[PDB]
Write a protein that binds this ligand. Sequence first.
Ligand code: HEM
Length: 154
Amino acid sequence: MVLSEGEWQLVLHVWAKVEADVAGHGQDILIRLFKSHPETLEKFDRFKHLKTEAEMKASEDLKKDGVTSLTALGAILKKKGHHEAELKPLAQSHATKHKIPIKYLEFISEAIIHVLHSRHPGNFGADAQGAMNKALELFRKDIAAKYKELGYQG
Ligand code: HEM
């Protein structure tokens, strides 16, 4: 699959807004993921014990991982499809060390769309959401392929 320049522009335009507050969006997204799919929290040994949203909001560790996650995703998106080099180390750690199934990447993709929809309505209309979904699907398809090559695929 390939995105058009117009689609990449819609993706990068809303991402430019996200970058005004990376830490804030990172928290919203991970917390959304953890509330909608509690099982995903188990993968984070550092804060698997957090019991409430209040505790999650106060966690500096959770915030730091949110920033690291979004910054890595942002670098991938800015490559507009030419992300082979960026995906290699990411696919290896998540497949071999963290053991993150593709299903969880779908869950976080859902959390990303939900948060952008809530915080950037004016820059996240139907066309913009469609483009973002397409970019995340491309990301998931390529990462899944690397998982297979790495002997994980799952
Ligand atoms: C948008 C997709 C994601 C991106 C871009 C991303 C990016 C990253 C980055 C850059 C790191 C640090 C370097 C590394 O270990 O590779 C990391 C660590 C990690 N990621 Fe992800 N990640 C994503 C999704 C997920 C999901 C869905 C989970 C689990 C539900 C997850 C679990 C972890 C864990 C457990 C670590 C290690 C944290 C630690 O112990 O310090 N990641 N991720």
